Each structure stands twice: as structure tokens, then as C-alpha cells.
Scaffold this active site. Structure first.
Site, PDB file in Angstrom:
ATOM      1  N   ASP A  99      -2.341   9.070 -13.403  1.00  0.00           N
ATOM      2  CA  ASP A  99      -2.375   9.954 -12.227  1.00  0.00           C
ATOM      3  C   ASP A  99      -2.995   9.241 -11.039  1.00  0.00           C
ATOM      4  O   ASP A  99      -3.991   8.536 -11.213  1.00  0.00           O
ATOM      5  CB  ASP A  99      -3.211  11.217 -12.475  1.00  0.00           C
ATOM      6  CG  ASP A  99      -2.787  12.001 -13.699  1.00  0.00           C
ATOM      7  OD1 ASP A  99      -2.357  11.378 -14.703  1.00  0.00           O
ATOM      8  OD2 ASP A  99      -2.937  13.245 -13.675  1.00  0.00           O
ATOM      9  N   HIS A 109      -2.709  11.198  -7.699  1.00  0.00           N
ATOM     10  CA  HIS A 109      -3.084  12.395  -6.944  1.00  0.00           C
ATOM     11  C   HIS A 109      -3.458  12.188  -5.492  1.00  0.00           C
ATOM     12  O   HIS A 109      -4.515  12.642  -5.022  1.00  0.00           O
ATOM     13  CB  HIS A 109      -4.184  13.168  -7.675  1.00  0.00           C
ATOM     14  CG  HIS A 109      -3.666  13.932  -8.845  1.00  0.00           C
ATOM     15  ND1 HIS A 109      -2.759  14.961  -8.707  1.00  0.00           N
ATOM     16  CD2 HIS A 109      -3.907  13.811 -10.170  1.00  0.00           C
ATOM     17  CE1 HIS A 109      -2.465  15.444  -9.902  1.00  0.00           C
ATOM     18  NE2 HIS A 109      -3.143  14.759 -10.804  1.00  0.00           N
ATOM     19  N   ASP A 158       2.143  12.487 -11.493  1.00  0.00           N
ATOM     20  CA  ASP A 158       1.034  13.078 -10.758  1.00  0.00           C
ATOM     21  C   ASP A 158       0.580  12.192  -9.613  1.00  0.00           C
ATOM     22  O   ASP A 158      -0.594  11.819  -9.510  1.00  0.00           O
ATOM     23  CB  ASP A 158      -0.104  13.456 -11.703  1.00  0.00           C
ATOM     24  CG  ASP A 158       0.159  14.753 -12.437  1.00  0.00           C
ATOM     25  OD1 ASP A 158       1.300  15.247 -12.397  1.00  0.00           O
ATOM     26  OD2 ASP A 158      -0.788  15.288 -13.061  1.00  0.00           O
ATOM     27  N   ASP A 216      -0.489  16.021  -4.878  1.00  0.00           N
ATOM     28  CA  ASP A 216      -1.376  17.175  -5.049  1.00  0.00           C
ATOM     29  C   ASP A 216      -2.809  16.716  -5.272  1.00  0.00           C
ATOM     30  O   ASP A 216      -3.067  15.572  -5.674  1.00  0.00           O
ATOM     31  CB  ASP A 216      -0.940  18.091  -6.198  1.00  0.00           C
ATOM     32  CG  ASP A 216       0.226  19.001  -5.842  1.00  0.00           C
ATOM     33  OD1 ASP A 216       0.452  19.308  -4.651  1.00  0.00           O
ATOM     34  OD2 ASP A 216       0.908  19.461  -6.775  1.00  0.00           O
ATOM     35  N   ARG A 217      -3.731  17.647  -5.033  1.00  0.00           N
ATOM     36  CA  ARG A 217      -5.187  17.446  -5.176  1.00  0.00           C
ATOM     37  C   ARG A 217      -5.726  16.586  -4.038  1.00  0.00           C
ATOM     38  O   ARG A 217      -6.506  17.065  -3.218  1.00  0.00           O
ATOM     39  CB  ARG A 217      -5.577  16.877  -6.552  1.00  0.00           C
ATOM     40  CG  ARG A 217      -5.028  17.664  -7.741  1.00  0.00           C
ATOM     41  CD  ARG A 217      -5.626  19.066  -7.783  1.00  0.00           C
ATOM     42  NE  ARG A 217      -5.348  19.741  -9.049  1.00  0.00           N
ATOM     43  CZ  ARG A 217      -5.899  20.890  -9.433  1.00  0.00           C
ATOM     44  NH1 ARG A 217      -6.768  21.518  -8.648  1.00  0.00           N
ATOM     45  NH2 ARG A 217      -5.577  21.420 -10.606  1.00  0.00           N
ATOM     46  N   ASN A 233       3.509  16.699 -14.223  1.00  0.00           N
ATOM     47  CA  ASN A 233       3.563  18.138 -14.018  1.00  0.00           C
ATOM     48  C   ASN A 233       3.411  18.545 -12.559  1.00  0.00           C
ATOM     49  O   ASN A 233       3.851  19.631 -12.179  1.00  0.00           O
ATOM     50  CB  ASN A 233       2.603  18.911 -14.942  1.00  0.00           C
ATOM     51  CG  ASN A 233       1.126  18.572 -14.717  1.00  0.00           C
ATOM     52  OD1 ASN A 233       0.734  17.406 -14.701  1.00  0.00           O
ATOM     53  ND2 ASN A 233       0.296  19.604 -14.575  1.00  0.00           N
ATOM     54  N   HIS A 234       2.837  17.663 -11.737  1.00  0.00           N
ATOM     55  CA  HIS A 234       2.681  17.949 -10.312  1.00  0.00           C
ATOM     56  C   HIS A 234       3.880  17.617  -9.430  1.00  0.00           C
ATOM     57  O   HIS A 234       3.894  17.990  -8.244  1.00  0.00           O
ATOM     58  CB  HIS A 234       1.406  17.318  -9.779  1.00  0.00           C
ATOM     59  CG  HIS A 234       0.205  18.156 -10.050  1.00  0.00           C
ATOM     60  ND1 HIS A 234      -0.240  19.123  -9.168  1.00  0.00           N
ATOM     61  CD2 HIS A 234      -0.620  18.214 -11.121  1.00  0.00           C
ATOM     62  CE1 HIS A 234      -1.299  19.726  -9.679  1.00  0.00           C
ATOM     63  NE2 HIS A 234      -1.555  19.189 -10.860  1.00  0.00           N
ATOM     64  N   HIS A 244       4.087  11.476 -19.066  1.00  0.00           N
ATOM     65  CA  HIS A 244       2.916  12.001 -18.387  1.00  0.00           C
ATOM     66  C   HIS A 244       1.972  12.814 -19.288  1.00  0.00           C
ATOM     67  O   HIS A 244       0.739  12.582 -19.302  1.00  0.00           O
ATOM     68  CB  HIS A 244       3.303  12.850 -17.186  1.00  0.00           C
ATOM     69  CG  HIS A 244       2.113  13.367 -16.451  1.00  0.00           C
ATOM     70  ND1 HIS A 244       1.311  12.545 -15.687  1.00  0.00           N
ATOM     71  CD2 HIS A 244       1.542  14.595 -16.416  1.00  0.00           C
ATOM     72  CE1 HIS A 244       0.305  13.252 -15.201  1.00  0.00           C
ATOM     73  NE2 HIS A 244       0.429  14.501 -15.615  1.00  0.00           N
ATOM     74  N   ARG A 258      -4.083  25.401 -21.156  1.00  0.00           N
ATOM     75  CA  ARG A 258      -3.448  25.374 -19.838  1.00  0.00           C
ATOM     76  C   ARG A 258      -2.511  26.556 -19.598  1.00  0.00           C
ATOM     77  O   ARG A 258      -2.131  26.815 -18.458  1.00  0.00           O
ATOM     78  CB  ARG A 258      -2.680  24.071 -19.632  1.00  0.00           C
ATOM     79  CG  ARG A 258      -3.530  22.822 -19.699  1.00  0.00           C
ATOM     80  CD  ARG A 258      -2.611  21.634 -19.525  1.00  0.00           C
ATOM     81  NE  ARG A 258      -3.225  20.326 -19.744  1.00  0.00           N
ATOM     82  CZ  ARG A 258      -3.587  19.500 -18.768  1.00  0.00           C
ATOM     83  NH1 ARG A 258      -3.445  19.872 -17.497  1.00  0.00           N
ATOM     84  NH2 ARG A 258      -4.082  18.305 -19.062  1.00  0.00           N
ATOM     85  N   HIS A 314      -2.549  12.549 -17.475  1.00  0.00           N
ATOM     86  CA  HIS A 314      -2.632  14.029 -17.465  1.00  0.00           C
ATOM     87  C   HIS A 314      -4.031  14.608 -17.775  1.00  0.00           C
ATOM     88  O   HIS A 314      -4.223  15.823 -17.736  1.00  0.00           O
ATOM     89  CB  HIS A 314      -1.559  14.542 -18.451  1.00  0.00           C
ATOM     90  CG  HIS A 314      -1.292  16.024 -18.460  1.00  0.00           C
ATOM     91  ND1 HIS A 314      -1.062  16.779 -17.324  1.00  0.00           N
ATOM     92  CD2 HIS A 314      -1.140  16.875 -19.504  1.00  0.00           C
ATOM     93  CE1 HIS A 314      -0.800  18.028 -17.671  1.00  0.00           C
ATOM     94  NE2 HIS A 314      -0.837  18.113 -18.989  1.00  0.00           N
TER      95      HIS A 314
HETATM   96  C1  LIG Z   1      -6.419  18.802 -13.233  1.00  0.00           C
HETATM   97  C2  LIG Z   1      -5.387  17.673 -13.252  1.00  0.00           C
HETATM   98  C3  LIG Z   1      -4.145  18.063 -12.493  1.00  0.00           C
HETATM   99  O1  LIG Z   1      -4.106  19.167 -11.908  1.00  0.00           O
HETATM  100  O2  LIG Z   1      -3.193  17.250 -12.478  1.00  0.00           O
HETATM  101  C4  LIG Z   1      -5.948  16.394 -12.654  1.00  0.00           C
HETATM  102  C5  LIG Z   1      -7.338  16.181 -13.226  1.00  0.00           C
HETATM  103  C6  LIG Z   1      -7.023  15.779 -14.662  1.00  0.00           C
HETATM  104  C7  LIG Z   1      -5.507  15.792 -14.670  1.00  0.00           C
HETATM  105  O3  LIG Z   1      -5.219  15.388 -13.337  1.00  0.00           O
HETATM  106  C8  LIG Z   1      -5.034  17.234 -14.677  1.00  0.00           C
HETATM  107  C9  LIG Z   1      -5.758  18.065 -15.742  1.00  0.00           C
HETATM  108  C10 LIG Z   1      -3.539  17.244 -14.926  1.00  0.00           C
HETATM  109  O4  LIG Z   1      -2.972  18.284 -15.333  1.00  0.00           O
HETATM  110  O5  LIG Z   1      -2.907  16.182 -14.700  1.00  0.00           O
HETATM  111 MN   LIG Z   2      -2.963  15.158 -12.917  1.00  0.00          MN
HETATM  112 MN   LIG Z   3      -0.809  16.213 -15.168  1.00  0.00          MN
END
Ligand SMILES: C[C@]1(C(=O)O)[C@@H]2CC[C@@H](O2)[C@@]1(C)C(=O)O
Ligand SMILES: [Mn+2]
Ligand SMILES: [Mn+2]
Length: 315
Positions: free
Chosen positions: A67, A69, A96, A99-100, A128-129, A177, A225, A252
Site C-alpha cells: 500500500d 495510500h 491501495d 485514499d487516506r 480494495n481502495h 492485495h 471488516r 492490506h
Molecule cells: C486501513 C487500511 C485501508 O483502509 O486501506 C490502510 C491501513 C492498513 C491497510 O491500509 C488497510 C487496513 C487496508 O484495508 O488496506
Molecule cells: Mn490499504
Molecule cells: Mn487494502
């Protein structure tokens, strides 16, 4: 406009260097150049199998990142520590990308530019993002609307749908991922055959690839989740044996040291967003693999300074 311009409508190495500097200095790529990168990369990605199959010869190497992000300044740090992508310095970014973090546009256009420049040696897997529901909530949709338009966001969403879901190196290392599956008996060919150009389903293999997590105990558990499952070491062992694989690399999850090796060696987590969201204080890592030795070699790194923009500013 005095910023980066494509050469004869195409990405070049000089363009990429210009773009990275332009972004470092917090400037915006012209919408027409952004548009061009997106339409061209959509074409490139749409020709790929859902399972990318890559051979690494004895002398060849690859770098696997987890990731990122939208932590653009950390992405530049990866390239500084590990060298720019090239035909002799290949990369996999394991989802990923957005996002964030609040430099998601900069991360994703930089990654897409390198995908166009080195299509056979720069690999992007969906996380997933890279989906609409997540982008709507966690910052990317807001960031694209602020910097460009809703129309530009729609195009990003369409490009993300063509991102492959997994990559297999030398028939031995599988990269995705999230992780493995809520059901036994899923095959590499099942992955190849997933019609991926969609938002993911709420269940089944496409969902699992983006969403699942390992657990230490044998079995499967309903995921905390709210989607997919947790899978134990027995799940991994069975999947690897059935598919003639050695181990999986996934991302992830944040890890304090930037990586973890679970399931007795069989399930590696790599996470490439250091000091995630300016709060977690974690190290990040990337992995080196070589054709002569597919065992993971971890390279840890820490966060570097970025401009005064808070995480989730655009959400
Ligand atoms: C919270 C996270 C996210 O939202 O992507 C972010 C922090 C850990 C990992 O990346 C996470 C859990 C994920 O789903 O990939
Ligand atoms: Mn992530
Ligand atoms: Mn993820």
C-alpha cells in the site's frame, strides 16, 4: 502552462522526471495530459489477464511494494532508495495507491505514467481502495473533484476496473492485495477467468483477492471488516499445494516493521506507507525477489517530510 508535456502524445523518461519534480513542488499536471495518460493506460490494462504471469530469469530482479495510500513524498523516497523503474529495475505495486493520503492524484498519475513507459516491467495490481465506494468515502473522489472534475473521477474509476487482480512470478510466488479465499479449491485458472472490469462483488473470489486477511489459527473466520474472511495457515498450505506455489505476498494491513511473515513462511505481508496517515509511526518496506532466489528480501524505510496537507483533507 509551463509544466510537463507529453512528447508526440506519449510518456517518455524525461516527461516522468519532469512530472515527479512538478508534483514534488505541489503543482498540477494539465488536465489534457492527465486525460491522455488515463485513456492510454486504460487501453494497456484492458489487454492484460486478470492474473498477470511474469517470468524472472536467473539474473533478473523485481521489487514488490505494498500500500502507498497517496503518500507521494514517500513514493519518491522509494524511487530514491531503490532507483527509478526501468527494464532492469522492475516494480510491482500491490494495490491501495489512493485514499487516506492527500497526494493520491500525484501517486496514481506517477504510477500510471510509469506503467505507460515500461509496460512489461511496471506492474499495478488492484487493491480494495481502487473502487468507487471506497474512493467516495476515503478521499480520492474528493481529491480528484478538487483538482480536476467529476468527469475526470469517472475516468479514473473506469481505469481502476481494468487493473489486474493478481500476479504470479515463475509459477511459484502469487501476489495479490488482500489474500486467499473464503472457499477451498480456487485455482490460478479461476483467477485468470475472473471478469474483473467491474466494481467488486460483495462475495466470492474477486472480493477475497481484494479484502481477505490471514489469521494465525487454523480455519476461516468471518472478517472483522464486514467483507470476505480471515484464512488460517491450513488454508494457505492447501492453496499453495494445489496450485504448485511456494508462497504468497499480500499487503492490506499496516505492520510496525513494514512487513510480516505468517503461516510459517507461506503468507508475507508487505506495507509501503511509512508513518501511515501521519499517525501510526510504522516503518514501511519493499521486497526484492530474484530469478535465482525467490525468497523475499526485505528493505525497510521510514517516512520523509511532506507539505502541510492533512490526511483525508479531501474526504
Ligand atoms: C486501513 C487500511 C485501508 O483502509 O486501506 C490502510 C491501513 C492498513 C491497510 O491500509 C488497510 C487496513 C487496508 O484495508 O488496506
Ligand atoms: Mn490499504
Ligand atoms: Mn487494502
Amino acid at each position: 502552462y509551463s509544466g510537463p508535456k507529453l512528447e508526440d502524445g506519449k510518456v517518455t523518461i524525461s516527461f516522468m522526471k519532469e512530472l515527479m519534480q512538478w508534483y514534488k513542488d505541489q503543482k498540477k499536471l494539465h488536465r489534457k495530459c492527465a486525460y491522455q495518460i488515463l485513456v492510454q493506460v486504460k487501453e494497456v490494462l484492458s489487454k492484460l489477464s486478470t492474473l498477470v504471469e511474469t517470468t524472472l530469469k536467473e539474473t533478473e530482479k523485481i521489487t514488490v511494494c505494498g500500500d502507498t495510500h497517496g503518500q507521494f513524498y514517500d513514493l519518491l523516497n522509494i524511487f530514491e532508495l531503490n532507483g527509478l523503474p526501468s527494464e532492469t529495475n522492475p516494480y510491482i505495486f500491490n494495490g491501495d495507491f489512493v485514499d487516506r493520503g492527500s497526494f493520491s492524484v500525484e501517486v496514481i498519475l506517477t504510477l500510471f505514467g510509469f506503467k505507460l513507459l515500461y509496460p512489461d516491467h511496471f506492474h499495478l495490481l488492484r487493491g480494495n481502495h481502487e473502487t468507487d465506494n471506497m474512493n467516495q468515502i476515503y478521499g480520492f473522489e474528493g481529491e480528484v473533484k478538487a483538482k480536476y472534475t467529476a468527469q475526470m473521477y469517472e475516468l479514473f474509476s473506469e481505469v481502476f476496473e481494468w487493473l489486474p487482480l493478481a500476479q504470479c512470478i515463475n509459477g511459484k510466488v502469487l501476489i495479490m492485495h488482500g489474500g486467499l479465499f473464503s472457499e477451498d479449491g480456487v485455482t490460478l485458472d479461476d483467477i485468470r477467468k475472473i471478469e474483473r472490469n467491474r466494481q467488486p462483488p460483495d462475495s466470492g473470489p474477486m472480493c477475497d483477492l481484494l479484502w481477505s486477511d490471514p489469521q494465525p489459527q487454523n480455519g476461516r473466520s468471518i472478517s472483522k471488516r464486514g467483507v470476505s474472511c480471515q484464512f488460517g495457515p491450513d488454508v494457505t498450505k492447501a492453496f499453495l499445494e494445489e496450485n504448485n506455489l511456494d508462497y504468497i505476498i499480500r499487503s492490506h494491513e499496516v505492520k510496525a516493521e513494514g512487513y510480516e511473515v505468517a503461516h510459517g513462511g507461506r503468507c508475507v505481508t508487505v506495507f509501503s506507507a511509512p508513518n501511515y496517515c501521519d499517525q501510526m509511526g510504522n516503518k514501511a518496506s519493499y521486497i526484492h525477489l530474484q530469478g535465482s532466489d525467490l525468497r523475499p528480501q526485505f528493505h525497510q524505510f521510514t517516512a520523509v517530510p511532506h507539505p502541510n496537507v492533512k490526511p483525508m483533507a479531501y474526504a
